Design an enzyme around this catalytic site. Structure first.
Site, short mmCIF file in Angstrom:
data_model
loop_
_atom_site.label_atom_id
_atom_site.label_comp_id
_atom_site.label_asym_id
_atom_site.label_seq_id
_atom_site.Cartn_x
_atom_site.Cartn_y
_atom_site.Cartn_z
N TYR A 158 0.82 -1.20 0.00
CA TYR A 158 0.00 0.00 0.00
C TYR A 158 0.85 1.25 0.00
O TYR A 158 0.44 2.28 -0.53
CB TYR A 158 -0.94 -0.01 1.19
CG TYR A 158 -2.07 -0.99 1.07
CD1 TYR A 158 -2.23 -1.77 -0.04
CD2 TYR A 158 -2.97 -1.12 2.07
CE1 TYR A 158 -3.24 -2.63 -0.15
CE2 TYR A 158 -3.98 -1.98 1.99
CZ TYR A 158 -4.12 -2.74 0.88
OH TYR A 158 -5.18 -3.62 0.83
N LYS A 217 3.33 -15.34 2.65
CA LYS A 217 3.41 -16.23 1.50
C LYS A 217 4.88 -16.48 1.18
O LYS A 217 5.40 -16.21 0.10
CB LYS A 217 2.66 -15.70 0.28
CG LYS A 217 2.52 -16.74 -0.82
CD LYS A 217 1.10 -17.12 -1.11
CE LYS A 217 1.05 -18.28 -2.09
NZ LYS A 217 1.70 -19.55 -1.66
N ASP A 228 -3.01 -18.25 1.88
CA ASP A 228 -4.10 -18.96 1.23
C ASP A 228 -4.73 -19.98 2.17
O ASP A 228 -5.94 -20.19 2.16
CB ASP A 228 -3.62 -19.63 -0.05
CG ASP A 228 -2.44 -20.53 0.16
OD1 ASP A 228 -1.84 -20.50 1.25
OD2 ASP A 228 -2.11 -21.29 -0.78
N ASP A 246 -5.68 -6.54 5.62
CA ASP A 246 -6.93 -6.01 5.10
C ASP A 246 -7.87 -7.14 4.70
O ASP A 246 -9.02 -7.20 5.16
CB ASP A 246 -6.65 -5.08 3.92
CG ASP A 246 -7.72 -4.01 3.75
OD1 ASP A 246 -8.81 -4.08 4.37
OD2 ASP A 246 -7.45 -3.07 2.98
N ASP A 292 -11.09 -8.58 6.99
CA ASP A 292 -12.41 -8.33 6.42
C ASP A 292 -13.18 -9.64 6.24
O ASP A 292 -14.41 -9.64 6.28
CB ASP A 292 -12.27 -7.58 5.09
CG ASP A 292 -13.37 -6.55 4.87
OD1 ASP A 292 -13.43 -5.62 5.68
OD2 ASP A 292 -14.16 -6.67 3.91
C1 LIG Z 1 -0.37 -24.39 -3.56
C2 LIG Z 1 0.09 -23.74 -2.38
C3 LIG Z 1 0.96 -24.34 -1.45
N1 LIG Z 1 1.40 -25.61 -1.64
C4 LIG Z 1 2.34 -26.33 -0.77
O1 LIG Z 1 1.78 -27.41 -0.09
C5 LIG Z 1 2.42 -27.50 1.20
C6 LIG Z 1 1.45 -27.59 2.31
O2 LIG Z 1 1.13 -26.46 3.10
P1 LIG Z 1 -0.38 -25.98 3.48
O3 LIG Z 1 -0.80 -26.75 4.70
O4 LIG Z 1 -0.26 -24.53 3.90
O5 LIG Z 1 -1.46 -26.07 2.35
P2 LIG Z 1 -2.26 -27.38 2.19
O6 LIG Z 1 -3.27 -27.43 1.08
O7 LIG Z 1 -1.31 -28.52 1.89
O8 LIG Z 1 -2.92 -27.74 3.52
C7 LIG Z 1 -4.27 -27.67 3.65
C8 LIG Z 1 -4.92 -28.18 4.90
O9 LIG Z 1 -6.03 -28.93 4.61
C9 LIG Z 1 -5.72 -30.30 4.69
N2 LIG Z 1 -5.81 -30.83 3.39
C10 LIG Z 1 -5.23 -30.30 2.33
N3 LIG Z 1 -5.50 -31.03 1.25
C11 LIG Z 1 -6.28 -32.06 1.61
C12 LIG Z 1 -6.85 -33.12 0.91
N4 LIG Z 1 -6.62 -33.22 -0.50
N5 LIG Z 1 -7.59 -34.02 1.54
C13 LIG Z 1 -7.76 -33.87 2.86
N6 LIG Z 1 -7.23 -32.86 3.57
C14 LIG Z 1 -6.48 -31.94 2.97
C15 LIG Z 1 -4.37 -30.38 5.17
O10 LIG Z 1 -4.22 -31.31 6.23
C16 LIG Z 1 -4.04 -29.07 5.63
O11 LIG Z 1 -4.34 -28.93 6.96
C17 LIG Z 1 3.18 -26.28 1.41
O12 LIG Z 1 4.55 -26.52 1.53
C18 LIG Z 1 3.00 -25.48 0.24
O13 LIG Z 1 4.31 -25.11 -0.05
C19 LIG Z 1 1.01 -26.26 -2.73
C20 LIG Z 1 0.15 -25.73 -3.68
C21 LIG Z 1 -0.12 -26.71 -4.79
N7 LIG Z 1 -1.28 -26.83 -5.61
O14 LIG Z 1 0.75 -27.53 -5.01
MG LIG Z 2 -3.83 -22.06 -2.77
MG LIG Z 3 -11.14 -3.19 4.68
#
Ligand SMILES: *c1cc[n+]([C@@H]2O[C@H](COP(=O)([O-])OP(=O)(O)OC[C@H]3O[C@@H](n4cnc5c(N)ncnc54)[C@H](O)[C@@H]3O)[C@@H](O)[C@H]2O)cc1C(N)=O
Ligand SMILES: [Mg+2]
Ligand SMILES: [Mg+2]
Ligand SMILES: *NC(=O)c1ccc[n+]([C@@H]2O[C@H](COP(=O)([O-])OP(=O)(O)OC[C@H]3O[C@@H](n4cnc5c(N)ncnc54)[C@H](O)[C@@H]3O)[C@@H](O)[C@H]2O)c1
Lengths: 359, 360
Positions: free
Chosen positions: A141, A192, A224, A248, A252
């Site tokens: 910003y 991030k 994310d 922000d 929100d």
């Molecule tokens: C895009 C962004 C980031 N990554 C990489 O993946 C690594 C994991 O980190 P993160 O915990 O922050 O994201 P994630 O989606 O893996 O975790 C989500 C949470 O929800 C649960 N969960 C995810 N996915 C599932 C599925 N398919 N089934 C059941 N539960 C799920 C997880 O337990 C978790 O709590 C990180 O290093 C980051 O670098 C990857 C991507 C991409 N598309 O590859």
């Molecule tokens: Mg994502």
């Molecule tokens: Mg606001």
């Protein structure tokens, strides 16, 4: 014991909501033996129509001389078409820098009365109590270089730079840590760092300070995921520290847990300097002047103004208490309306909130 | 027919979910007279452990010369401490730019069976339907200048540049409009044009193309309201277009509406070039190898591959229908478990989709 308070009403519902909080402020403070010097100064669309710039110098000095500043909101349809330097929102960013209020506190806690008012299932949203610590005076910003130039192609290219110096991250981190201690002793830094060299430094400095705060337990979460988590299990967070553009957005998003965006206040603090207290909402251009708006968030910013900026903790509790009585009596504005409650508007709530202060 | 598919199993839960999807992709396509040449390549942590970089040059070429790319996820604890150039996540970014997949389609639509799986109340979350069109190859994720430098006061200063050139905005807006007209005819551009000159141009360019699509009703919303809107009244949105970083955030938030992040597929499309299909979730380092994972996102990401990337619509509907059959039979993984359903893990949930594909 007299205080100098600057009211920046602004646009949209800004004036509507601040007038209410001003009265709540005078009454609640008066009960704990304090009177106030109020002083309206222009900002945003208001200032544009009057002096031609969003933040006049006359306002900045008026805010600095004051003990604390209470802002309503900024922006409106009329000025949506100005040059970037003459949009109203540019005044808000400037007043944050001008006041040097880097540490931004947005507390989203669900009151038992508004659980039916949330859109989350009861079990998910009942008892949530998180605090968002947002870096306010820096980042994308305020990042230079920025602008829209035209390179040789004849193509327009817009650009901003998300940039944080180390000392900028350090100061917001400590505030996260100090705050996370005053609460449940858990801290969550949101960045991030899987992509952004800015977020790499962000996490790097935050992990450093954890040794200075062992009373506080620090964890790191990507931005994310955090947006998803605030809907999956929002009860998990105690304190979240993150940067401007994520502060922000996430704060929100978190509002809709407590019932509406109109429930959340914000305190913006600085060293020495007087603090800036505003609601995170703003600025209902579509219910402006219709007297529909929810003023609670602005009232609580006056509560936070007393609690964090002037330290009159007792008065601030009276403010919180009144909002609680008002809601116990069933009074809801449109956004926090639940079945079997009483749908009031804005003045007609502020009054019977003020009934509770005065009783 | 006979198509060449590159499998990029990534890390974490990546392998298992892609493996399951590989079987479903095989059977569903097979029923419609379609065969596949599956070619597995290293990406992310796997490749770092093999050749030492997140995206090997051999992987890119194999990915380019195939008809569709099926990825799992990327990243894991083991590699979280590498130098910035050596992070698995950078390989994901690299394969997208290499494949020039600027148009990211992440559709979050709430299925009748999974309404109870959401944490949004039924009335809010029932009938939700929206599609996020995300700018994938540009923006802050790819903006130069970028890095960590040191100013003369010796302070480390980190920076990225959120930058969009006009054509970057134009082409993705076109995808958004084109998506809306096949959809319900509403488009919602999300930016921060009250602060960001990048977004000012984003708005300037998107409104400009609105004259070319009178069929689409275009509206503009700032990102902070957008986040609150996806929770206040998500039934409103039809199609959402936005930039790289805002797409990441909003699309993850929208996932929980449909029940969990494990329900959402994503298709990333390019001009002429083969598309890259991945589930929007991460590598879930916490549930990897426990066989807890939800495969549906990747099974549905395989569905998008047939419909959007290869044009085998009939086979693509076979995958979609089977996921429905399994869910009607009560099967949930942990993330989408609602009371009185049958809790399964990754391997059987996948078998129960297959169980059902092979019934028709
Ligand atoms: C895009 C962004 C980031 N990554 C990489 O993946 C690594 C994991 O980190 P993160 O915990 O922050 O994201 P994630 O989606 O893996 O975790 C989500 C949470 O929800 C649960 N969960 C995810 N996915 C599932 C599925 N398919 N089934 C059941 N539960 C799920 C997880 O337990 C978790 O709590 C990180 O290093 C980051 O670098 C990857 C991507 C991409 N598309 O590859
Ligand atoms: Mg994502
Ligand atoms: Mg606001
Ligand atoms: N930091 C600020 O002061 C600020 C932040 C964001 C935007 N502005 C300016 O306000 C107008 C409009 O912005 P919006 O995208 O419309 O966001 P909101 O104005 O807050 O609207 C959110 C929706 O919720 C309603 N709403 C807000 N506050 C409410 C209260 N107290 N009661 C009931 N309903 C409320 C709004 O009507 C919206 O429907 C822009 O110019 C922007 O620049 C300032």
């Amino acid at each position: 014991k007299r205080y100098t308070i600057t009211l920046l009403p602004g646009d949209g519902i800004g004036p509507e909501v601040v007038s209410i909080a001003k009265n709540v402020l005078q009454q609640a403070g008066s009960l704990e033996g304090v009177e106030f010097n109020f002083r309206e100064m222009p900002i945003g669309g208001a200032a544009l129509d009057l002096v031609g710039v969003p933040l006049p110098e006359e306002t900045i000095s008026a805010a600095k001389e004051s003990d604390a500043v209470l802002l309503g909101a900024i922006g409106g349809y009329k000025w949506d078409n100005n040059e970037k330097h003459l949009r109203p929102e540019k005044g808000l960013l400037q007043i944050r820098a001008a006041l040097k209020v880097f540490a931004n506190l947005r507390p989203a806690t669900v009151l038992p009365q508004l659980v039916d008012a949330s859109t989350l299932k009861r079990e998910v949203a009942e008892g949530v109590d998180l605090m968002v610590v947002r870096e306010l005076t820096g980042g994308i910003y305020f990042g230079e270089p920025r602008g829209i130039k035209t390179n040789e192609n004849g193509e327009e290219v817009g650009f901003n730079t998300e940039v944080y110096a180390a000392h900028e991250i350090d100061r917001i981190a400590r505030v996260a840590f100090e705050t996370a201690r005053k609460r449940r002793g858990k801290l969550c830094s949101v960045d991030k760092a899987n992509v952004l060299e800015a977020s790499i430094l962000w996490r790097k400095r935050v992990t450093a300070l954890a040794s200075e705060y062992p009373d506080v337990e620090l964890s790191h979460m990507y931005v994310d995921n955090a947006a998803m988590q605030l809907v999956r299990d929002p009860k998990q967070f105690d304190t979240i520290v993150t940067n401007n553009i994520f502060g922000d957005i996430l704060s929100d998003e978190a509002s809709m847990i407590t019932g509406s965006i109109g429930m959340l206040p914000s305190a913006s603090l600085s060293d020495s300097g007087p603090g800036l207290f505003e609601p995170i909402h703003g600025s209902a251009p579509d219910i402006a002047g219709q007297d529909k708006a929810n003023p609670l968030a602005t009232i609580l910013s006056a509560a936070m103004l007393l609690k964090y900026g002037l330290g009159e903790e007792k008065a601030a509790k009276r403010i919180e208490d009144a909002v609680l009585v008002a809601l116990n009596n069933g009074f809801r504005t449109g956004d926090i309306y639940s079945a079997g409650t009483k749908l009031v508007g804005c003045k007609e709530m502020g009054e019977e909130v003020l009934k509770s202060v005065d009783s």
